[PDB]
Amino acid sequence: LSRFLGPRYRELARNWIPTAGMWGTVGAVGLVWATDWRLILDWVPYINGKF
Amino acid sequence: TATFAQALQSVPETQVSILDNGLRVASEQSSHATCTVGVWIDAGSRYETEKNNGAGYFLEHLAFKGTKNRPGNALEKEVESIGAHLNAYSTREHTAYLIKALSKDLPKVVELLADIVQNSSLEDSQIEKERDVILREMQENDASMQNVVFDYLHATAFQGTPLAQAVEGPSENVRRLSRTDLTDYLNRHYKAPRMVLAAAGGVEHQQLLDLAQKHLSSVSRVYEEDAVPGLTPCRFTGSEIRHRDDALPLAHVAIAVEGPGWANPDNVTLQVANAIIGHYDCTYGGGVHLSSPLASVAVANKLCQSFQTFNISYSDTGLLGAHFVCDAMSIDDMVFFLQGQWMRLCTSATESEVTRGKNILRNALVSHLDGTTPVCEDIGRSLLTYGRRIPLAEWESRIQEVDAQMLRDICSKYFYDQCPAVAGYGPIEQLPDYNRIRSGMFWLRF
Amino acid sequence: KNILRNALVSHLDGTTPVCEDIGRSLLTYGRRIPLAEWESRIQEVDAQMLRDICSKYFYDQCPAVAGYGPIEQLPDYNRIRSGMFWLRF
Amino acid sequence: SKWLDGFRKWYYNAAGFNKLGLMRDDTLHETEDVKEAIRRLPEDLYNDRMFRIKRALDLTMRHQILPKDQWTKYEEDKFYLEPYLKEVIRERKEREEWAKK
Amino acid sequence: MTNMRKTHPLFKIINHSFIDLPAPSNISSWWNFGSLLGVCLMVQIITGLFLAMHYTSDTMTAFSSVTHICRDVNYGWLIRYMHANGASMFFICLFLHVGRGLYYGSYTFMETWNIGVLLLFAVMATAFMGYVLPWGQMSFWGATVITNLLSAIPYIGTTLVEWIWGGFSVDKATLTRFFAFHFILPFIIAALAIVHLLFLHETGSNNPTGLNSDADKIPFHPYYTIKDILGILIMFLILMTLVLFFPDMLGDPDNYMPANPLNTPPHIKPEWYFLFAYAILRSIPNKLGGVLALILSILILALMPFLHTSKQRSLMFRPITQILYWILVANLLILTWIGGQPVEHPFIIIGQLASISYFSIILILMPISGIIEDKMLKLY
Numbered sequence A: 001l002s003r004f005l006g007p008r009y010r011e012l013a014r015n016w017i018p019t020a021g022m023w024g025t026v027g028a029v030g031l032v033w034a035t036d037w038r039l040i041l042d043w044v045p046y047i048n049g050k051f
Numbered sequence B: 001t002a003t004f005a006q007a008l009q010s011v012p013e014t015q016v017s018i019l020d021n022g023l024r025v026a027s028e029q030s031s032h033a034t035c036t037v038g039v040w041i042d043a044g045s046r047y048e049t050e051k052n053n054g055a056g057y058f059l060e061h062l063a064f065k066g067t068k069n070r071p072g073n074a075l076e077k078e079v080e081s082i083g084a085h086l087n088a089y090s091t092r093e094h095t096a097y098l099i100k101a102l103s104k105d106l107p108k109v110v111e112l113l114a115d116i117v118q119n120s121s122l123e124d125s126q127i128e129k130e131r132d133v134i135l136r137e138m139q140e141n142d143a144s145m146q147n148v149v150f151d152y153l154h155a156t157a158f159q160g161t162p163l164a165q166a167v168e169g170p171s172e173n174v175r176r177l178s179r180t181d182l183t184d185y186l187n188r189h190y191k192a193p194r195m196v197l198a199a200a201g202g203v204e205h206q207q208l209l210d211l212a213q214k215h216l217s218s219v220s221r222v223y224e225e226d227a228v229p230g231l232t233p234c235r236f237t238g239s240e241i242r243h244r245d246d247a248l249p250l251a252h253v254a255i256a257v258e259g260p261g262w263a264n265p266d267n268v269t270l271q272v273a274n275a276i277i278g279h280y281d282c283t284y285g286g287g288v289h290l291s292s293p294l295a296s297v298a299v300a301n302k303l304c305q306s307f308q309t310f311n312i313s314y315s316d317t318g319l320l321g322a323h324f325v326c327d328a329m330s331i332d333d334m335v336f337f338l339q340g341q342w343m344r345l346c347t348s349a350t351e352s353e354v355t356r357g358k359n360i361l362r363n364a365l366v367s368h369l370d371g372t373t374p375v376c377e378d379i380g381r382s383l384l385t386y387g388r389r390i391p392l393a394e395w396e397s398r399i400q401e402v403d404a405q406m407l408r409d410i411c412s413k414y415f416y417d418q419c420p421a422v423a424g425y426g427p428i429e430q431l432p433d434y435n436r437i438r439s440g441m442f443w444l445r446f
Numbered sequence C: 001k002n003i004l005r006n007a008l009v010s011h012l013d014g015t016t017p018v019c020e021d022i023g024r025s026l027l028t029y030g031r032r033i034p035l036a037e038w039e040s041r042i043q044e045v046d047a048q049m050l051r052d053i054c055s056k057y058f059y060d061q062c063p064a065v066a067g068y069g070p071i072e073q074l075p076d077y078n079r080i081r082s083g084m085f086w087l088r089f
Numbered sequence D: 001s002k003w004l005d006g007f008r009k010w011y012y013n014a015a016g017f018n019k020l021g022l023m024r025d026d027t028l029h030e031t032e033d034v035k036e037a038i039r040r041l042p043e044d045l046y047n048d049r050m051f052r053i054k055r056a057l058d059l060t061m062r063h064q065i066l067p068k069d070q071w072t073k074y075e076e077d078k079f080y081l082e083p084y085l086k087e088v089i090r091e092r093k094e095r096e097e098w099a100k101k
Numbered sequence E: 001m002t003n004m005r006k007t008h009p010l011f012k013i014i015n016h017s018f019i020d021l022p023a024p025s026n027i028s029s030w031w032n033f034g035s036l037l038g039v040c041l042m043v044q045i046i047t048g049l050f051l052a053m054h055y056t057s058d059t060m061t062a063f064s065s066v067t068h069i070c071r072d073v074n075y076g077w078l079i080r081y082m083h084a085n086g087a088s089m090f091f092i093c094l095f096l097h098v099g100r101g102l103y104y105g106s107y108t109f110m111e112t113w114n115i116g117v118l119l120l121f122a123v124m125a126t127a128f129m130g131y132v133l134p135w136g137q138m139s140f141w142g143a144t145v146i147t148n149l150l151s152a153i154p155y156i157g158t159t160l161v162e163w164i165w166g167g168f169s170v171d172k173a174t175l176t177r178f179f180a181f182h183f184i185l186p187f188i189i190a191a192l193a194i195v196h197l198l199f200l201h202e203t204g205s206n207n208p209t210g211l212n213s214d215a216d217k218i219p220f221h222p223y224y225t226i227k228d229i230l231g232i233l234i235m236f237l238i239l240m241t242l243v244l245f246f247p248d249m250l251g252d253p254d255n256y257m258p259a260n261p262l263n264t265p266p267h268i269k270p271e272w273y274f275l276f277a278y279a280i281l282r283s284i285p286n287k288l289g290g291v292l293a294l295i296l297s298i299l300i301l302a303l304m305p306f307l308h309t310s311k312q313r314s315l316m317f318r319p320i321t322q323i324l325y326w327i328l329v330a331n332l333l334i335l336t337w338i339g340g341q342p343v344e345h346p347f348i349i350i351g352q353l354a355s356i357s358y359f360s361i362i363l364i365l366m367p368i369s370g371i372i373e374d375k376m377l378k379l380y
């Protein structure tokens, strides 16, 4: 995959890192919320009252 | 050799003086044997109050039909006698009366311009003849589709303000205005502090200043009732006007957002953004190898007949957007691709396209400032809008300070999640309505 | 029948097609068939024997097909041969 | 060398597209570059190529091959598509390099 | 005007898909097989529907209902054995369809290939739970074994297996939900087959030469109409001789005993179409690694379009990769044989070498062979 090895593609990747990281944060928060994961929701203060 | 920097700094400076009336007198000297001398007045359709909506246009028609000192065509006989060219134009904010002549005919030309600004005899028979002329030229101007589309865009973008109304005005006002309305408009909006005498080419500044002292001194300087007009900001409205007429062969669509204005420097950055998108029409020889992605996809998919980008600026407002001409069955696709390019400039601007846009803007500015007429035009607009003539070195500095990060920041400030004004004319059924365009004004992936 | 009557009477007009018809008639039939005989043979034709003759020469017969030009959408011989009969009949 | 050339003729006969009358460049899979090079061909070579492809498809349809005198011999297998393919490949690399920088 | 076949909106879909569809003239009998699959799918559904008219998904009466179908329902033995041997025939036709797609370069139709891989996963899951349904000894113990390999997944596997079980082991809830899922999945398989045909008719179909067959194309009707009817009739000959003459040569005898959780069989196997995957999983001496080996075996079957490094499409003119392909098919036969054998000498080392050679042939040897062929044909 040597097509995308250049300064323009590196600049595009660097520009799209924070949006992808924010979407990964969205996915992780949604996964923890939907599965009701005890490894994280036991640490958030207001969520502790339902356990 | 000399690089771009000292070639720009070797341009002669525009020297500005001021008379006792407040009339600005600005000139720039070159080695040409010809010259362009014009008068720029801060008076357009924005200063009209819907009862005199065609006063500037109709005065622009009447201004060459004779004065008190030079009655009738003898006046234009004089501007034939030296072989000079006489032009005038009116916009929504500025009016210009300019003469291209030789250098040695510099005094009489200035004297001629003096008559045109303060001695115009408005004969009633000439008023009727120019009324019929204005009616027939509106009857040919509505055949030109892009003027109709840009007037529709101005109307729907500046609803309820004096910036919606056209320069020509409605036809009822053309049938209605008399000589006294023209006299009141002439005594209200032709004030000496709102006037610039601009000269470009083979002119001496001291001789031009002496001629302005001789002829252009004591124009009015006084509003005669202590009733000074004030410029009022215009409300922008995200809206849509759709003039459907299916018998036309081609459709013209303009989409714009609110511009920053004359004095806001990020205009320069926005100009670079326009240079990334560029212009296209069907006679361009580039083929599929055009650098603009919109032009390349238009050639590849046979979508548009033409498109262009505009940054129209008025006093702290403006319209920034794109106008395209295409057949009906392509319209929606064109809109989609156009919006994608805007969002790419809001999200994924790279350094190479920014460098290309900066080079295109440098070429555009220097190639536009060529000849005595566009230099005089730039001097008049610069003294009316900025209050000073911005030199090309300052433009080059403001261009070279633009990088990709501030370009996508300013583009996100002005394009992303903004309500546009849409004006369509022709077979525009497949032109999407306001929800689809408004949803295309942002991306769900940012 | 009216079209055929008008066609043959209009064709036999002028010396050249009459001589042409005489030459073909004596070469093929051995005699010149008079035009009243043609009219009698036309007027003896009704819908029943037209159906019988068209079924004998047309229905479920293998045709000869010639094509020239952009004939890609010209159907196969199997499709044409299937179209030379009806399943409803 | 000569042994490699003889083994390459043996592999050419073992490949078996000469038994259908096909050339080397007829058997190329139509990628974007191959379709562009086919579109750049002159009409005589284009018509020859598609008649050869149609005849090969007909022979494969009836599960037969050509007579041995009608086989594409090794020394008359002219690479007609190869310079057009090199032109298309080189200009695609140029466009890729320009988009890369 | 009266060309209803191409103006009626319902009839134009059948026309465009089966009558005026331009098909290559030179496609062999291998191209019949996918059509057979659709017909076989219909057969399964029909037999299953009649098998659903007398079967109860209760652990105390599932075996009793199967015996009541085979003994008291008129021709119920015929319907049951047509269903079982039609599952076997479906997997035979799947294997030959996939082998045609691998050999003739048909995986370059990437969307059709991926929808096929999803279809293959759905059919394997459907057949597994359908084999659990008669509630014999081998059904219960195969379900227990396969769910334990699912429980090999770390940190979520055990809770997922007790969620799928509906309890502590394979029980009443597992059998009833397996009946529900075994009913509902073939209709999703039919919808995915509609998507399969949609993508293929979008891209057109391939020919054994791998060339552009646009110069010589024929209508689907009546050529491939009568050719696929001949193929359906041959397939029904093989299916009905398998039903009426050798009904138990593919099944297992221990499924004719009722399910006993106290008694375990001496050797536990799945059916023959899962035996190569069982041998692939069983060769690696780890649980999670074996489950990943099975999943990645079907996933490298999905990954096959990214490994094509040849300028020719089909293997008709590629003899070295032909040899490698037949070695791969031979290796799959060896893995199917090993999957039905217990773990003694030398079956462990034979299965280990078979799985290693399988992954090495698919992942390494075929693109290297294609590069060597491109060198030998003087392409570059």
Ligand SMILES: CCCCCCCCCCCCCCCCCC(=O)OC[C@H](COP(=O)(O)OCCN)OC(=O)CCCCCCCCCCCCCCCCC
Pocket: D011, D014, E319, E320, E323, E327, E330, E331, E334, E350, E353, E354, E357
């Ligand atoms: C050299 C020629 C053949 C031998 C001498 C015989 C000459 C006869 C001459 C008369 C004409 C016969 C007909 C010719 C028809 C077309 C040509 C042909 O069939 O060629 C032979 C064939 C392919 O040869 P080719 O692929 O061109 O060789 C590549 C080498 N560079 O096939 C071969 O070359 C042989 C391939 C043998 C492959 C053996 C594989 C063994 C291993 C299988 C393992 C399977 C199980 C794996 C399990 C793993 C886990 C335990």
Ligand code: HEM
Pocket: E041, E044, E045, E046, E047, E048, E049, E051, E052, E055, E066, E080, E083, E084, E086, E087, E088, E090, E123, E126, E127, E128, E130, E131, E132, E133, E134, E182, E183, E184, E186, E187
């Ligand atoms: C929606 C349609 C289907 C229904 C309603 C259905 C229903 C049933 C029923 C009730 C049984 C239990 C009776 C028996 O044991 O023979 C069964 C068994 C089975 N089904 Fe299906 N089935 C369907 C489709 C399929 C499909 C598509 C396959 C895969 C090809 C399949 C594979 C099997 C297998 C392997 C068995 C076990 C046969 C045995 O051991 O007796 N079924 N099915």
Ligand code: HEM
Pocket: E030, E031, E032, E033, E034, E035, E037, E038, E041, E094, E097, E098, E101, E104, E106, E107, E109, E112, E113, E114, E115, E116, E117, E119, E120, E123, E189, E193, E196, E197, E200, E204, E205, E206, E207
């Ligand atoms: C559920 C069972 C399946 C059905 C009903 C099915 C149906 C079909 C049908 C009707 C065709 C067109 C006729 C033909 O060329 O044989 C076809 C072709 C095809 N199928 Fe499937 N298919 C199935 C499984 C698969 C699988 C598992 C794959 C992926 C490995 C696959 C990939 C393909 C490909 C690539 C073609 C194109 C053949 C070519 O043009 O060479 N199919 N299928």
